[PDB]
Every structure is written in C-alpha cells, then in structure tokens.
Symmetry: C2
C-alpha cells in the first residue's frame, strides 16, 4: 500500500477538513500543492484525477477520491483503528452524515463560496445583505446543533466537527462569531483548539485564508 497523497492548499477549508482527519487518524501522507488561485486545478493531469477540478482530492493507491466529506468518511472507514470518528451505528452515522451534508450546502456552498467566488472574480459591488444573513443563519443553526453536547454530532469528536470547523474558522473573516451571542460555538471552538494537531491541520491554513481575503476591500450592504 503506497502512502496517501492529498492535493490542495492549506488555505482551503475543505482541504483542512482532510488534514484534521489525517492527523486524528495518525495516517502518514504526502501533501502536494495545487494552487487553485493560479488555476493549477485545471491542469489536464489534475482533470484526469478529478473532473470537478476541486481541492481536496486524495489518491489512495491509484484511486482518486474527491469532496472532503467523501474523503474523510472513507479515511475513517478504511484506516480508523475504531469507528470513533465516524460511527458505524446507523443512527449515530445519520447525525454525522446530516452535519456533513449541512456543511456541504448550507455552509460551504451557500455561505462561503457564494462570497469568495464573486470576490475572486473581481466584483466590487459590495457584498449583498443576503450573504451576511446566510452566515448568521449558519451560526444560529450551529448554536442549536451544539445544545446539550460537547461536539457537533453528539458527545464524541467526529469528522463532522472537522468539516464544520474548517469552514466556520474561515467564515469568521467575514463575520466574527460573537462569543456572547454564541457561547456554545465559542466553547466548541475552544475545545477543538485544544486538540494537539488543530493548529497544524486547520489553524495555520485558516490564518493564511484570512490573509488572502484581507487583500480585498470588501463590505457588506446594509440592505
């Protein structure tokens, strides 16, 4: 079994979701930079590996898997000593899968990429109010989801925590999480920050992402 290869850049939230998972699993891997900002994801070689041309993409012994959620489920299912990070119990898995799918649509597509795509596409319109509202909606739901539990999908750390923190840590550049309004999110962030691998796997790239975004002079419209 050759060692795994992760394609992407640290700045990318879904890449960091995979970095978190690989660290938690203590699985060695090679990281190969694919700079989406310089369109390296459109290389013909990369398209062969992933016709959607997204990062992260993962190689495992000549097979290419993409979508961070598909990847991190695969990684735990394949390499986890136990299923702790992605329980096989069907009800527990259904909560984790719901949280992962929530992250795919409501968080990444609707709240994050909806801003970053027009921003990187040179638009200076002033970000519409609906996009501000979409981020607050994420925080409001996450605060509810965390009720009565230390982690986002129950009482144990799972890949849903990794997926959701990857994007929440980056949404903060646009709208900081108010720690008074959202004490559960704040506490959950602090809990994940204590993981020994958190800063290497997510924090550093979150900071790089923030630096990239602060190059632009964005504003939100009041209406």
């Amino acid at each position: 079994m050759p060692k795994l290869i992760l394609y992407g850049l640290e700045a990318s939230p879904p890449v960091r979701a995979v970095k978190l998972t690989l660290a938690a699993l203590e699985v060695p891997y090679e990281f190969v930079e694919v700079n989406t900002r310089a369109k390296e994801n459109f290389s013909e070689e990369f398209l062969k590996k992933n016709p959607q041309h997204t990062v992260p993409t993962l190689e495992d012994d000549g097979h290419y898997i993409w979508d961070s959620h598909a990847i991190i489920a695969y990684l735990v299912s394949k390499y986890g000593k136990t299923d702790s990070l992605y329980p096989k119990d069907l009800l527990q898995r259904a909560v984790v899968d719901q949280r992962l799918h929530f992250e795919s649509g409501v968080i990444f597509a609707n709240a994050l990429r909806s801003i970053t795509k027009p921003l990187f596409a040179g638009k200076q319109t002033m970000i519409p109010k609906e996009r501000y509202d979409a981020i607050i909606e994420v925080y409001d739901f996450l605060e509810k989801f965390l009720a009565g539990n230390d982690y986002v999908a129950g009482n144990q750390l799972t890949i849903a925590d990794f997926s959701i923190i990857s994007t929440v840590s980056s949404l903060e550049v646009f709208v900081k999480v108010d720690t008074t309004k959202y004490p559960r999110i704040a506490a959950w962030f602090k809990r994940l920050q204590k993981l020994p691998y958190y800063e290497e796997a997510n924090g550093n790239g979150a900071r790089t992402f923030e630096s990239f975004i602060r190059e632009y002079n964005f504003t939100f419209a009041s209406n």
Copy 2:
C-alpha cells in the same frame, strides 16, 4: 414503522420517496408544506431544529437531510447493498455525488433561485444563477461518462438525489438533449422505473406549477 414528513413538491423529499419505493419499505407520509411555513410549528421544530423537509421518524428517532436519510434507509433496510455499496471505494463515489448534490446542485443552483423567488423578491434572476445550472449539467454529463448511472453502472441513492433536483432545474433551464445526450439517456432510464412517477414525477410537476406562478426572467451579464 416509518414516517416521512414533507411535501412531494420538494426535490429532497422526492429523493427519499424514490429510495423508499426502491427498497419496497412501507411508510406513512405526513404533509409538512414548507411553502406555507408549516415547518415552523412547535411540534415540527422539536423534531427538526433546522426546520427542513424531508424529515424521517423511525422508531421515535428523527433524522433529516435527504442524503443522511436515504443512506440510513439503504443501510438499515436494504436486502443487499446495491443502492449504497459498502465497498469503501464505491461508497466514496456515491458519497461524493451525494455531497455534490447538497452543495453544487441544491444549494448553489436550485435554492439560490427558489428562496428569493418564493419570497416575492426577485423576478429578474442574476445571470450567475443561470451559469450555476449550466455548470451542473456540464459536470453531470462528465460524471455519467459511459455509465448507465451517476456513480457507476449500478443504480444508487446518488441517482435518486440528483434526479430529484435536475428534474426541477429544467423548469429554469431545459436540458438540451443534443448537447447533453448522457443526461438525456439517464433521465429516460430512471423514468422507466415503475415507481418513478409516483416518487418523483408527480412532485416535480407540482414544483413546476409553483415556479410558473412567477414571471421570471434571467438578467444578462
């Protein structure tokens, strides 16, 4: 036994109807009409704090998000794993296609239009929203490649998820069957399933009826 909460007009509800029909698992259907905001009753909020349909009750447990539901259904009730293979590499393709539907399709292409439309906001839809639909078709055509189904040569829950929204995106932008022959052939293949019209077709028609209440056009760039 099982209770499905929703309205068949809703694409993700149809993905679940398709799955339940394929599995031949009986269920009770309870109408929760989100267009009429029935999803904000105290009773429904207790069952699902995200107030989305579909929501499933199975043995007193509430599960939501169509993709979590349909995976759960096959894993629990499937006589074989055909619809959601346990093989980890085949599962990774299906999970990718499911997550593709959650984000690139439902969130970015469909709900991005229907939310403001149904709220009475915009009649003139930004061109980026047209582009988002074309991008789905381009990717889906590529994904289908030479295979009969979206994740390979066997029917899976990914087909049910993706057809549920693609059948409704056509209201805004028809699939050009000359340009997208694989999508066209895949649509026909699914339409042949004996439960297709009950599980997806009827709701797609109702949803189309909702959309055509509005006088929508697309803006230029």
